[PDB]
UniProtKB/Swiss-Prot annotation, chains A, B:
Top-level taxonomy: Bacteria, Pseudomonadati, Pseudomonadota, Gammaproteobacteria, Enterobacterales
Chain residue ranges for the region called Allosteric domain: 207-343
Name assigned to this protein: Carbamoyl phosphate synthase large chain
Chain positions recorded as Mg(2+) 3 binding sites: Q99, E111
Family: Belongs to the CarB family.
MGS-like domain location: 207-343
Organism: Escherichia coli (strain K12)
Name of the gene: carB
GO cellular component term, pick one: carbamoyl-phosphate synthase complex
Assembly, per entry: Composed of two chains; the small (or glutamine) chain promotes the hydrolysis of glutamine to ammonia, which is used by the large (or ammonia) chain to synthesize carbamoyl phosphate. Tetramer of heterodimers (alpha,beta)4.
Keywords from the UniProt entry: Amino-acid biosynthesis, Arginine biosynthesis, ATP-binding, Ligase, Magnesium, Manganese, Metal-binding, Nucleotide-binding, Pyrimidine biosynthesis, Repeat
Function text: Large subunit of the glutamine-dependent carbamoyl phosphate synthetase (CPSase). CPSase catalyzes the formation of carbamoyl phosphate from the ammonia moiety of glutamine, carbonate, and phosphate donated by ATP, constituting the first step of 2 biosynthetic pathways, one leading to arginine and/or urea and the other to pyrimidine nucleotides.
């Protein structure tokens, strides 16, 4: 009345110790951000952003795309409808932001921020519409209608925003994502395709990701299934794979034989070693659970330490994969050209 | 003054509880049997048989070859000489049998049986010399020279002896080889090459071995080195592989990436499951240590229950591998013919 996610009774207390609003955690859910302007008369949708990282990974630290790269129009429209309702009910006059979660083709409302959100600039840039100015006019007494800004702009190119985290400034921290924001800045990637935009945002954020080498895959239960496909993509891109017992087990059941690696406590060599010897060019590590987390800490610290690009979400992993297809230095475009393409 | 191999002090005691002579166990040594006859004037080497399974697996349960398939002539000549020395010293008059163990190019005596041994019949069949008839004559007073049997016979073909175990009659028993004899009988395989004899011997032993499929590998520490080769030989022959945790680690480091399989405690699916489901056509499982044994019991028992061919020794598995290169149904030969090839 710090945020944590508890999985069970034990966990619950367990947290209590070290310790109030309880909410059901919408697992394996897509997170969405919407910025919109309302003038009491109507509502203009500034932008619908679909996060790369799932709900549970703070929006502030999620990568995102404008326009959505996976959500259905249908569903977006739902969200678009909801905002409007919210707008009016709350009697918004100026900017507003709404965050949703999409679970099983269902739309859940996370929060409503009836002010300017840190997303505004990215949206303005992507769409060519200075939402801030507009909403400012709106607040002063000049309607959207009167402003001649009434129709929702859908760019012809992909705009992906990625973030930068201060982890390297505090080595003692576990460089891992969560419900609480820790990033200091963001970059924007502009592309013809999501993969392209993403590759640029990724490169822009200072990533050491390579297009070749050996990948380390160590994912959680709930991801043990999808990883299969990500592993495939990596193989296709020419990566050689290593895998921790559990995950290896799963891949193999699908036709994928990675090179099994040892957790720290299981033998030498182990991960830390390999990481340390620059055996990997990529690491995909997903964890769920206070302990498992604590138990996988070393993987992340080492990786951060060794300059190995790594992802801590599967959705994050896929985007990285997809981006392997694109070439961030292939084509550059200016903000001006960008806006020029808008109809 | 029921035998057992103890690895350490703890073990020692450990045994002591459950339970005397004490003999250093000659690890990774080749076991050899030698059948000879002495008439007080000379000594006749009937045959030198090299065991496939190493010392520690009772000669009565080991497969063997006449002539040896790996021992050097040098070293066989050393055994030959010791046999003669022993024959004379002990005053043998008739048949005798000598058991040696070879380690690091050194011959060790395991025991002397001053009488007809169970290998006699096989040796006679393989060499065309009826040792029992000869030794009987000697015993009755007709010397080896008088008889015209004074030169060792080394047949032009390989003769392999394989055994049959009654484990299927006692499901409650762990179908594992060791220092105590459990076999009820034996067969013989005759071939142009070791591979061919072995193959015939194995088929004859009612082995369900197949020339294709998926193999399961789960070997002890010591075997971790030679396994790679086995794994490779299996790969060449067109098999697919599965392996448990440690084995997998080793294979990975060698470049072989088998499909990982779960130890029963590890989870699902595990070995029993797979064995039970017909996933395997061959199983190679080695174990050292009373406790390590008791644990792995389940692999061995399922293998047997399900009729999957299984080897419990690395030597054995190699032999099985060699046999993949042969066709036990290709050529047959009568004993008359075999004998007729002897010069
Ligand atoms: N019920 C929930 N299910 C899933 N994720 C949630 C839930 N509540 C919050 N989150 C996640 O936590 C973040 C923080 O929640 P929010 O109410 O937006 O906090 P803040 O005021 O810090 O922005 C969101 O960006 C989202 O990823
Ligand atoms: N010191 C030893 N090192 C290795 N193997 C040995 C040793 N002593 C005996 N063995 C193993 O035990 C078996 C039985 O020993 P042996 O003295 O021949 O017993 P038995 O009287 O039953 O024939 C051998 O065939 C061999 O595999
Ligand atoms: N947008 C958050 C940064 C992603 C980071 N590579 C991670 O996967 O943890
Ligand atoms: N030579 C004795 C039989 C061998 C059996 N396949 C085993 O390896 O245990
Ligand atoms: Cl905000
Ligand atoms: Cl005997
Ligand atoms: Cl029984
Ligand atoms: K998110
Ligand atoms: K808030
Ligand atoms: K033996
Ligand atoms: K004996
Ligand atoms: Mn929020
Ligand atoms: Mn013996």
């Amino acid at each position: 009345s710090a945020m944590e996610i508890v999985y069970d009774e034990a966990d619950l207390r367990r947290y209590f110790q070290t310790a109030v609003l309880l909410d059901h955690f919408l697992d394996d859910a897509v997170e969405v951000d919407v910025d919109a302007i309302c003038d009491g008369e109507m509502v203009l949708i500034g932008g619908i952003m679909e996060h790369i990282e799932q709900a549970g990974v703070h929006s502030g630290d999620s990568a995102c795309s404008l326009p959505a790269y996976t959500l259905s129009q249908e569903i977006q429209d739902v969200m678009r409808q909801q905002v409007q309702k919210l707008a009016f009910e709350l009697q918004v006059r100026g900017l507003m932001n709404v965050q949703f979660a999409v679970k099983n083709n269902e739309v859940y409302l996370i929060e409503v921020n009836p002010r300017a959100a840190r997303t505004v600039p990215f949206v303005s840039k992507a769409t060519g519409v200075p939402l801030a100015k507009v909403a400012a006019r709106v607040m002063a007494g000049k309607s959207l209608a009167e402003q001649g800004v009434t129709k929702e702009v859908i760019p012809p190119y992909y705009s992906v925003k990625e973030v930068v985290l201060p982890f390297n400034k505090f080595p003692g921290v576990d460089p891992l994502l969560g419900p609480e924001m820790r990033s200091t800045g963001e970059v924007m990637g502009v592309g013809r395709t999501f993969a392209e935009a993403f590759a640029k945002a990724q490169l822009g954020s200072n990533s050491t990701m390579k297009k070749h080498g050996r990948a380390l895959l160590s994912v959680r239960e709930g991801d043990k299934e999808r990883v299969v496909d990500l592993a495939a993509k990596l193989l296709k891109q020419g990566f050689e794979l290593d895998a921790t017992h559990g995950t290896a087990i799963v891949l193999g059941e699908a036709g994928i034989n990675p090179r099994l690696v040892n957790k720290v406590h299981e033998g030498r060599p182990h991960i830390q070693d390999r990481i340390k010897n620059g055996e990997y060019t990529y690491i995909i590590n997903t964890t769920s659970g206070r302990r498992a987390i604590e138990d996988s800490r070393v993987i992340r610290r080492s990786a951060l330490q060794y300059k190995v690009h790594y992802d801590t979400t599967l959705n994050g992993g896929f985007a990285t994969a997809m981006a392997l297809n694109a070439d961030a230095t292939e084509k550059v475009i200016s903000v001006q050209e960008m806006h020029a393409q808008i109809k």
